[PDB]
Amino acid sequence: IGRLPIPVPKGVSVEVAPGRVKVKGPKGELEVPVSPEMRVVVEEGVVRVERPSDERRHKSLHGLTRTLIANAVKGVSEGYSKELLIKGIGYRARLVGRALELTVGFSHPVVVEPPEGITFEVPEPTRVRVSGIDKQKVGQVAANIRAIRKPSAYHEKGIYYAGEPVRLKPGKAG
Template sequence: MALAVVLREEIPVPEGVEVTIDKEVTVTGPKGELKRKFKSRNVSIRQEDGLVVLETRFPKKKDKAMLGTIKSHISNMIHGLTEGFTYKMKIVHAHFPMTVKAAKDKVTIENFLGERYPRTANIIGTAQVKVQGDEVVITGVNKEDVGQTMANLEQATKIKGKDPRVFQDGIYLVAKE
């Protein structure tokens, strides 16, 4: 007689947040709504009184990894819709003062290392960028959008072909909240 080996993870759903599961997982909270599809045959997602339950039977190594990944994504969706994500970045320049402006879907960096043409970085999804003096604040409900926007800003000011110990100008991540 074989015993069914089941790996089970539970995610508590706080008050004010509603989770709907059909072909995609929809999380609705005080700050909006996020939807995401998860493609995994071996991981089942369902709801039980105030919990989102993830299960896999006879898990292999990849099934365990997928279970953890899906759990993290759903937890991040819930966290984003209740508290949101905030990344703070610092504008650093030694000689040439940079001008950073946030528009609708792009951030423009002018006078970077004295360059004549501005550099741009895309703002992804619903992330919002605010420039306050020498600080850039990126906020949003989707962790992936906020993180990718931050990475785009950092990459736009990456210096190539020069010693990074000497040329330290750029926009760098300082804090995540």
């Protein structure tokens, strides 16, 4: 009925492997997992997740494999870039090539090294974030950076994903 519906365009290399569905698009044959009963189809332009029963575990499973491989593919069509905005009079942003940089923790040696699909975009450096390939991996790294110097809901000099409105805890007397 509705918990398994997706379209598989692009001439996507959307192909079932040995326990893993290999979704190949720009570079990575993203591994979108596969459980034994789930089972799925991809014909012409239609991509469907199967439901070998209708219990709790499966139902979720459906939502999963579905949205997931869904990902795998839409992804492979593009790649995946992360929208991160650094903002803080107490911070600098520069790529250096294959590395973090940036700081508010007054002893700037902030040397990271974009794992993979991850590339660094500093055109600012306020608007400055990353690109990846792996839906999550990207999110995760972003969090890495963010958290490592970010929080501040009362006075702020931080790194913000999209830049959520974040709290505004007043201070001394007022």
